Amino acid sequence: RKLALKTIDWVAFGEIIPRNQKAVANSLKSWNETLTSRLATLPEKPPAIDWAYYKANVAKAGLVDDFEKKFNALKVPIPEDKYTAQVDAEEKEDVKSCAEFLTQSKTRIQEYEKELEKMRN
Amino acid sequence: EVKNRLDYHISVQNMMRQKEQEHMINWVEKRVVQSISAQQEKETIAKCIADLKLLSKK
């Protein structure tokens, strides 16, 4: 693991015209920050083991080898995705925003500015 | 988590040698400390070296 990245956007937070999440985003960013700091903290890697020399200094040297093989050959799986609708249940609710609220909002605007012109006249 | 049990086995065998070292030693030394004493000639070597002091210091 390894995971990529989007910066704070406070404008975003407030707006969520899916009302059922309005609070959540404020809290959810702060949950994020928990991860953000936590990841920035740690490195990815320990070292490894020179089993040859440790076998020299372990008289039960079989052990070093056995655990060596199992460990070094082993790879444990990255904590696995369960959710990826985020992108989606957004970008669709972002259309929800645009088309649905874009159109209605832009069409309203036009009438306003249309009467003003003649009101400047 | 891996390392410490490996190091434990070594560390115990190390600790287990020293103790065996003192106890071994104690029997070997507590046996033969006694026998040596027949050598008059280490007091032969005391005088001898003692002359190589008494003469050879000044």
Summarize the structure.
This is part of a larger assembly, with chains A (121 residues) and B (58 residues). Chain A is mainly α and 121 residues long.
Shape estimate of chain B: elongated
Q: Which structural class is indicated by helix and strand composition of chain B? A: mainly alpha
Q: Tally the beta strands of chain A.
A: 0
Distance between the termini of chain B: 65 Å
Derived structural class of chain A: mainly alpha
**Quaternary:** part of a larger assembly
> Approximately how much helix is present in the residues of chain A?
55-70%
Strand content of chain A: under 5%
**Euclidean distance between termini CA atoms of chain A:** 64 Å
Along the chain, the helix and strand elements of chain A come as HHHHH
Largest sheet of chain B: none
The DSSP helix count of chain B reads 2
Largest sheet properties of chain A? none
Counting DSSP H or I runs of 4 or more residues, the number of helices of chain A is 5
For the secondary structure, the number of strands of chain B is 0
Work out the strand percent of chain B.
under 5%
The largest contact between protein chains, plus residue counts on each side, is:
A-B, 10 and 6 residues
Anisotropy-based shape of chain A? rod-shaped
